[PDB]
Design an enzyme around this catalytic site. Structure first.
Site, PDB file in Angstrom:
ATOM      1  N   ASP A 192     -12.820   5.546   0.267  1.00 51.37           N
ATOM      2  CA  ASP A 192     -11.973   4.943  -0.754  1.00 51.37           C
ATOM      3  C   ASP A 192     -12.695   3.778  -1.413  1.00 51.37           C
ATOM      4  O   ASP A 192     -12.105   2.723  -1.670  1.00 51.37           O
ATOM      5  CB  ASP A 192     -10.615   4.516  -0.192  1.00 51.37           C
ATOM      6  CG  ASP A 192      -9.563   4.325  -1.269  1.00 51.37           C
ATOM      7  OD1 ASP A 192      -9.728   4.843  -2.392  1.00 51.37           O
ATOM      8  OD2 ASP A 192      -8.566   3.637  -0.975  1.00 51.37           O
ATOM      9  N   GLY A 234       0.820  -1.189   0.000  1.00 46.16           N
ATOM     10  CA  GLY A 234       0.000   0.000   0.000  1.00 46.16           C
ATOM     11  C   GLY A 234       0.860   1.247   0.000  1.00 46.16           C
ATOM     12  O   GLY A 234       2.089   1.197  -0.019  1.00 46.16           O
ATOM     13  N   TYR A 237       0.937   3.210   2.548  1.00 42.52           N
ATOM     14  CA  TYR A 237       1.440   3.298   3.916  1.00 42.52           C
ATOM     15  C   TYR A 237       1.632   1.924   4.556  1.00 42.52           C
ATOM     16  O   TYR A 237       1.745   1.838   5.780  1.00 42.52           O
ATOM     17  CB  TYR A 237       0.519   4.143   4.804  1.00 42.52           C
ATOM     18  CG  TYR A 237       0.207   5.536   4.299  1.00 42.52           C
ATOM     19  CD1 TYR A 237      -0.702   5.732   3.273  1.00 42.52           C
ATOM     20  CD2 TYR A 237       0.799   6.656   4.871  1.00 42.52           C
ATOM     21  CE1 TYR A 237      -0.997   7.000   2.805  1.00 42.52           C
ATOM     22  CE2 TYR A 237       0.506   7.933   4.415  1.00 42.52           C
ATOM     23  CZ  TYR A 237      -0.394   8.097   3.379  1.00 42.52           C
ATOM     24  OH  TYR A 237      -0.694   9.358   2.915  1.00 42.52           O
ATOM     25  N   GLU A 269       2.554  -2.683   3.880  1.00 44.83           N
ATOM     26  CA  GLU A 269       2.899  -3.843   3.075  1.00 44.83           C
ATOM     27  C   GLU A 269       2.036  -5.005   3.541  1.00 44.83           C
ATOM     28  O   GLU A 269       1.818  -5.175   4.741  1.00 44.83           O
ATOM     29  CB  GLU A 269       4.379  -4.176   3.247  1.00 44.83           C
ATOM     30  CG  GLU A 269       4.877  -5.332   2.419  1.00 44.83           C
ATOM     31  CD  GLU A 269       6.392  -5.354   2.353  1.00 44.83           C
ATOM     32  OE1 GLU A 269       7.039  -5.429   3.422  1.00 44.83           O
ATOM     33  OE2 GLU A 269       6.937  -5.293   1.232  1.00 44.83           O
TER      34      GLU A 269
END
Ligand code: R7W
Ligand code: NA
Length: 327
Positions: free
Chosen positions: A154, A46, A48, A50
Site C-alpha cells: 500500500d 481507516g 478497518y 479509527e
C-alpha cells in the site's frame, strides 16, 4: 494457465525462518496497559480502524492510537506480527504498545507520533534535492521490509509521514502488508487505484516485493512532473489504459504473453493501440527544474510492466539520481 513467478531477491527468506516469524496466526500478543494512554483527538478513520492522537501519560510523549474494527477477519494478527518483526528498521513506524481498547474491545495499536504534514500535502512543493532526499529515505524502509520478507502493498503518499521541519520520514499503515512466500498466489485487491501495479490490474496473483517499486515509481512521477496522480484512472480498468497511454500497448501485450496471462476481455474495447511516449513529453516549464537525465532514467527503470525487470530497492539506491544526496 499463468506461468509462475518468483522474486529475484530475498526469495527464500521466510522459508528459512522459524515458523513463529511468519506464522502470525500463532502469535501471542503481549498486552500493555490501556490506562497509560489518554486519547487526545480523533485524526481520522481507516477502512478497518479509527485513529486518534493521544498522550502517553507515563512519559507525557505524544502517541497515535489505531483502534482496529472487529470486521478485520483475522487480519489484526498479521499487521501486529509484521510491525513487531520490522520494529527498529530504518524509517519504519515504531509500534510502541498494543492495548485492548475499553470501548471497542478490539486491539489498539500505539505508534510513535510523527509531526508530519502527511507527504501528500508536501510532495508537490519539494525542491529537486528534497525529492531525491526523501525518495532515498523511503527506499531505506522498503529495502528493509523486503529483506525481512515483507511486502507493504500500500505504498502511496498518504502512507509516508514526513516531518519536514526535522527532515524525518516514516512508512506507516502496514494493514495490507504480507509475508512473501515463493510460489504463493496473493489477493490482487491491494494498494490504492493510482498506485496499483500492472500485475494487479491484469489479475496476476504471483507477485512480490516489486509491486512496491511500481507504487514508488508512481509517486516519483507525480513529484518530478507535478502531476497528481500521474496515472489518473477513473476505475481499475481505465487505470491500465492510462498506463498504456504512457508505456505503450505492445510491451503490455508482451508482458501478458510472457506470464501467460488471460487478459480480461473487457480490455479489448478500451485499451486501443499506443506507443510508448518518451519521458520528455511530460516536461514543461513548471516542472523542468525537477527533471534531470538521472531522474528520467531512474523513473524509466521503476515503471516497467514486467515486475521482474523493475529495479529492486537496493538497485534503486545505487542509481546515479542519488549521487547528489549526501550520505
Ligand atoms: O491507519 C494508520 N496506520 C498506521 O500505521 C498509522 C500510523 C501513524 C503513525 C504516526 C502518526 N503521527 C501523526 C499522525 C498520524 C500518525 C499515524 S495511521
Ligand atoms: Na547519495
Amino acid at each position: 494457465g499463468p506461468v509462475p513467478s518468483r522474486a529475484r531477491v530475498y526469495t527464500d527468506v521466510n522459508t528459512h525462518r522459524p515458523s513463529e516469524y511468519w506464522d502470525y496466526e500463532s502469535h501471542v500478543v503481549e498486552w500493555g496497559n490501556q490506562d497509560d494512554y489518554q486519547l487526545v483527538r480523533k485524526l481520522g478513520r481507516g477502512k478497518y480502524s479509527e485513529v486518534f492522537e493521544a498522550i502517553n501519560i507515563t512519559n507525557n510523549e505524544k502517541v497515535v492510537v489505531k483502534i482496529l474494527k472487529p470486521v478485520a477477519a483475522a487480519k489484526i494478527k498479521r499487521e501486529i506480527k509484521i510491525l513487531e518483526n520490522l520494529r527498529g528498521g530504518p524509517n519504519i513506524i515504531t509500534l510502541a504498545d498494543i492495548v485492548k481498547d475499553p470501548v471497542s474491545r478490539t486491539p489498539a495499536l500505539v505508534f510513535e507520533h510523527v509531526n508530519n504534514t502527511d507527504f501528500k500535502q508536501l510532495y508537490q512543493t519539494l525542491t529537486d534535492y528534497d525529492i531525491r532526499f526523501y525518495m532515498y529515505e523511503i527506499l531505506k524502509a522498503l529495502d528493509y521490509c523486503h529483506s525481512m520478507g515483507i511486502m507493504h502493498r500500500d505504498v502511496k503518499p498518504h502512507n509516508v509521514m514526513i516531518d519536514h521541519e526535522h527532515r524525518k520520514l516514516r512508512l506507516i499503515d502496514w494493514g495490507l502488508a504480507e509475508f512473501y512466500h515463493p510460489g504463493q498466489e496473493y489477493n490482487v485487491r491491494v494498494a490504492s487505484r493510482y498506485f496499483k501495479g500492472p500485475e494487479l490490474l491484469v489479475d496476476y496473483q504471483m507477485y512480490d516485493y516489486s509491486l512496491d517499486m511500481w507504487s514508488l515509481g508512481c509517486m516519483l512521477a507525480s513529484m518530478i512532473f507535478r502531476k497528481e496522480p500521474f496515472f489518473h484512472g477513473h476505475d481499475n480498468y481505465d487505470q491500465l489504459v492510462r498506463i498504456a497511454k504512457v508505456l505503450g500497448t505492445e510491451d503490455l501485450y508482451d508482458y501478458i504473453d510472457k506470464y501467460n496471462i488471460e487478459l480480461d476481455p473487457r480490455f479489448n474495447d478500451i485499451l486501443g493501440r499506443h506507443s510508448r511516449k518518451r519521458w520528455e513529453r511530460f516536461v514543461h516549464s513548471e516542472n523542468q527544474h525537477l527533471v534531470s537525465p538521472e531522474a528520467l532514467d531512474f523513473l524509466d527503470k521503476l515503471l516497467r510492466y514486467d515486475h521482474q525487470s523493475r529495479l529492486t530497492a537496493r538497485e534503486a539506491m545505487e542509481h546515479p539520481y542519488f549521487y547528489t544526496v549526501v550520505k
